[PDB]
Amino acid sequence: INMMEYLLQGSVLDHSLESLIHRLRGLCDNMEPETFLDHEMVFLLPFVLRARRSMGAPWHLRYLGQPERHALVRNCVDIATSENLTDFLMEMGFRMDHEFVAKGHLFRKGIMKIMVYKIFRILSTEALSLSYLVELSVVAPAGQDMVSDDMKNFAEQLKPLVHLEKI
């Protein structure tokens, strides 16, 4: 079974966020969100792969195909892998061009997930952007229009603070 995601992105100023975090937390159901610190890579043989380490969970990698409605969808197959993956993909022949760590908070929902973070460039962490980014990644096998429609309602609820659209 293979699933394709429904995600679409937007960014939020620093002063804005203080209202956004309270807005998102109350709007959706959750308890005491968690700060997620992960160190992501990108691998090219063309078959662009993303392997993420989080500061004791295992290295989770994910592939996103080419995009295929009010949503952006590309075939995705995400597979959890144990440690020592990076050297494994070196022996594969894959080459790493850049790697960036992401910092922020994520809030959940019934199916959809919201994660607010800022991209850090590595040389040694530097803020690539002054404003965070938020997406509404939804994972669902055999994607149908019904799942995407539900996101439209939720996005409209979040429209005032940040207006987000797929790109």
Binding site: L13, S16, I119, R121, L128, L130, L161, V162
Partner: peptide, 21 residues
């Protein structure tokens, strides 16, 4: 009517999908 910079979104989004920086 601050609280969201569209250009920061577009410049940033171009980074995550393809390496901008």
């Amino acid at each position: 009517k601050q609280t969201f910079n569209p250009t920061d979104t577009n410049a940033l989004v171009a980074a995550v999908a393809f390496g901008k920086g």
